[PDB]
Symmetry: C2
């Protein structure tokens, strides 16, 4: 297993009302910028992931444009949502 423990904790259970900072790749700096743009809970970012039909390129570009995520951060966030969806959606 090469994922972060933080990825593993997120994909292991329904997300409920978890804050956006529970997402893999979303540290405190990215989290605050997402919160300022209205993406305050992880499920709101899931929402954008789903509205983009789970497309990696569109989602990672959206994350970059919205909070300045770098490639690793956007890959980790995308991967965490993709695996959560595979488990629970």
């Amino acid at each position: 297993m090469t994922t972060s423990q933080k990825h593993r904790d997120f994909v292991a259970e329904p997300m409920g009302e978890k804050p956006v900072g529970s997402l893999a790749g979303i540290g405190e700096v990215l989290g605050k910028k997402l919160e300022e743009r209205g993406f305050d809970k992880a499920y709101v970012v899931l929402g954008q992931f789903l509205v983009l039909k789970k497309d990696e390129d569109l989602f990672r570009e959206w994350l970059k444009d919205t909070c300045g995520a770098n490639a690793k951060q956007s890959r980790d966030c995308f991967g965490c949502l993709r695996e959560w969806c595979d488990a629970f959606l």
Copy 2:
């Protein structure tokens, strides 16, 4: 009360179910949603979540997007809200 379509939707993960599986979303509405990119139920779930599960804003969005009436948008909202309470 609820339809059986609602109960069937809220009882299980939606996976790749088409948009027409949502309560309230019949053939006409489903066609119009598909034409605008919302071809699977989870894409509509996505919009519900992006709108922070806000009943008024989601139902208005559904009306503006596919012409759903008050009953249709009511049923679609309720099915998504109850699905989320069970699985999200």
